Amino acid sequence: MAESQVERFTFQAEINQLMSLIINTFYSNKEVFLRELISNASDALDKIRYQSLTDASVLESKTELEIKIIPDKTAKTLTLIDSGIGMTKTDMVKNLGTIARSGTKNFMEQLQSGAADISMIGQFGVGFYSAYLVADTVIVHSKNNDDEQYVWESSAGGEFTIALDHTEPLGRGTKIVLHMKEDQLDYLDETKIKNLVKKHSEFIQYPISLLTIKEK
Numbered sequence: 001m002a003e004s005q006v007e008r009f010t011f012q013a014e015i016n017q018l019m020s021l022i023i024n025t026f027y028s029n030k031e032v033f034l035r036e037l038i039s040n041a042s043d044a045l046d047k048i049r050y051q052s053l054t055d056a057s058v059l060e061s062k063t064e065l066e067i068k069i070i071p072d073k074t075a076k077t078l079t080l081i082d083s084g085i086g087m088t089k090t091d092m093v094k095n096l097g098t099i100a101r102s103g104t105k106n107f108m109e110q111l112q113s114g115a116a117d118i119s120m121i122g123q124f125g126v127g128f129y130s131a132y133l134v135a136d137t138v139i140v141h142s143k144n145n146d147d148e149q150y151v152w153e154s155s156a157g158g159e160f161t162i163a164l165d166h167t168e169p170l171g172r173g174t175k176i177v178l179h180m181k182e183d184q185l186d187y188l189d190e191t192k193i194k195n196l197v198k199k200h201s202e203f204i205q206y207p208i209s210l211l212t213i214k215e216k
């Protein structure tokens with residue numbers, strides 16, 4: 001018998017509206033989600049790398065600076081792991097949905113006016129929410145040197161939860177798990193995801209491993 005305390009939070013109103021706009025509108029090309037996942041991993045890796053220049057001890061929790069991308073058709077998941085800075089519990093509450101910058105309202109306005117298309121979401125400071133183009137549920141496991149490992153989860157609908165994480169220890173970094181929508185399962189096809197990772201990583205300075213999971 002296991003026990004966990006789970007904390008439930010409400011999304012900021014504009015973030016809720018944005019998630020609704022991302023989920024309930026048709027977009028012909030959703031590949032930006034993968035660009036944004038990889039972008040966030042790279043930024044997290046840069047942050048810990050630069051921290052290490054001024055204090056080498058920050059890397060002791062995990063010496064490797066790398067990205068792993070794991071399509072799993074059986075599980076209907078795409079997982080992206082980085083060994084970057086990671087997020088504390090408070091970092092996840094603040095960065096993943098309780099605070100909204102002015103980018104949110106302006107992005108929704110520009111989507112509706114035609115000034116911006118969905119592929120431009122990262123420029124408005126809300127790139128993370130692009131995951132909901134292709135995923136019904138997003139799970140973010142993260143470990144920062146300053147906290148225990150936590151897991152954030154949301155299926156949208158106005159709420160997210162955060163709990164102490166009892167799954168595989170990361171050492172340091174973030175493991176984002178996208179539970180893919182049925183009509184978006186093609187993004188788990190090995191050749192398709194391999195080639196898109198190539199397309200969306202030309203400028204990425206960290207090693208990327210693609211690990212395709214086959215069941216039995």
Ligand SMILES: [Mg+2]
Nearest residue numbers: 039040127128
């Ligand atoms: Mg980003």
